[PDB]
């Protein structure tokens, strides 16, 4: 299986190599052209939604000058599996801004739920998405239930194409004010969880910002913005995978191969 993944020269070969269901959009932000693979099919966002939870906070803060500096309590009882930053702060509090950073760069689950409380929950994140021009991605539940996926149940799903368009509008476009979008881009550029995923297949010519996602069933995702270090137009790359027949580690290998194929498609 490892060899098949490595030998896959296109997205369909890669999906076949893992017997999975792969969704990809590679978007050229200069022309708007994109090269997809099941890009209009729904997949669970899992933690990839955290990029947009943080964007919702940033957007709200543009009209609320004290919001990012507000402190929210972290209690030992709210600690979830995978709460690496907030766990050190149990019994005290953290700023909203620091909860945003934690949830993006470590995928901290407790941080995400606290930010949902601050912003107005799944409806608020959905409203931000709709207002930005995304009528497809939708936030419905909190951690950990939002990671659940069933075909025909659109809760907490996106499509590779909708998410790619949204990353462009929000991380590179005018949905947020420049300082807000730059802060969000910086968090994505500082991500710590994606080193075995898209980043592992992308060459040094790219400065990469990304956000991973996964669930305990078969999903593993990674969405990224690629800025050319030498200057020029950025690209957006979304990758969603369901692949229950391979291991969690092999799922990352699939995402890395998505990166390798994409890097070849760009040049």
Active site residues: 47
Tell which residue, 138, 66, 50, has the closest CA to residue 100: 50
Resolution in Å equals 1.5
Contact 51, 211 (CB under 8 A): yes
Q: SS in 3 state form for 138-151?
A: CCCCCCCHHHCCEC
Contact 265, 13 (CB under 8 A): no
Tell which residue, 79, 61, 72, 102, has the closest CA to residue 187: 102
Whole-number Å distance between alpha carbons of 124 and 83: 23
φ, ψ of residue 114 to 5 degrees: the values are -70, -35
Q: What is the CA radius of gyration of the chain?
A: 17
User: Which strand ranges, in their side-by-side order, compose the sheet holding 206-214?
Assistant: 34-37, 21-28, 235-242, 219-228, 206-214
Q: Point out which residues pair with 221 in neighbouring strands.
A: 213, 240
Whole-number Å distance between alpha carbons of 85 and 99: 8
Contact 172, 181 (CB under 8 A): yes
Strands (E) in the chain, as ranges, are 21-28, 34-37, 43-44, 71-74, 92-95, 157-158, 206-214, 219-228, 235-242
**CB neighbours (10 Å) of residue 52?**
26
φ, ψ of residue 190 to 5 degrees: the values are -90, 10
φ, ψ of residue 63 to 5 degrees: the values are -110, 0
Q: Residue 124 to residues 6, 29, 74, 178: CA-CA distances in angstroms?
A: 41, 27, 22, 21
Tokens of 122: 């799944």
Say how far residue 34 (Cα) sits from the centre of its chain. 18
Tell which residue, 73, 91, 47, has the closest CA to residue 215: 47
Q: Point out which residues pair with 91 in neighbouring strands.
A: none
Tell which residue, 223, 184, 226, 220, has the closest CA to residue 202: 226
Whole-number Å distance between alpha carbons of 147 and 142: 9
Using the structure block, give the residue that is written with the tokens 């881009």.
185
Structural domains of the chain ordered from first start: 1-267 (3.40.710.10)
Whole-number Å distance between alpha carbons of 210 and 202: 12
Say how far residue 137 (Cα) sits from the centre of its chain. 12
Per the entry, the structure determination technique was X-ray
Asked if the bond preceding 144 is cis, omega within 30° of 0, the reply is: yes
Q: Which helix (H) or strand (E) holds 253?
A: helix 248-266
């Amino acid at each position: 299986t490892d060899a098949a993944i490595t030998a896959a020269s296109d997205f369909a070969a890669l999906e076949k190599a893992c017997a999975g269901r792969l969704g990809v959009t590679l978007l050229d932000t200069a022309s708007g052209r994109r090269i997809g693979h099941r890009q209009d099919e729904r997949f669970p966002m899992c933690s990839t939604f955290k990029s947009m939870l943080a964007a919702t906070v940033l957007s709200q803060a543009e009209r609320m000058p004290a919001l990012l500096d507000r402190r929210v309590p972290v209690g030992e009882a709210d600690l979830l599996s995978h709460a690496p930053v907030t766990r050190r702060h149990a019994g005290k509090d953290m700023t909203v801004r620091d909860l945003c950073r934690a949830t993006i760069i470590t995928s901290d689950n407790t941080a995400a739920n606290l930010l949902f409380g601050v912003v107005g929950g799944p409806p608020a994140v959905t409203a931000f998405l709709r207002a930005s021009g995304d009528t497809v991605s939708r936030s419905d539940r909190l951690e950990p239930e939002l990671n659940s996926f069933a075909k025909g149940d659109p809760r907490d799903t996106t499509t590779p194409a909708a998410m790619a368009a949204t990353l462009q509008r929000v991380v590179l476009g005018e949905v947020l004010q420049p300082a807000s979008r730059q802060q969000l881009a910086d968090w994505l550029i500082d991500n710590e969880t994606g080193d075995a995923c898209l980043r592992a297949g992308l060459g040094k010519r790219w400065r990469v910002g990304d956000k991973t996602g996964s669930n305990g069933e078969d999903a593993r995702n990674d969405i990224a913005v690629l800025w050319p270090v030498a200057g020029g137009a950025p690209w957006v790359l979304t990758a969603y995978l369901q692949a229950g027949a391979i291991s969690y580690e092999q799922r990352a290998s699939v995402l890395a191969q998505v990166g390798r194929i994409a890097d070849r498609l760009i040049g």
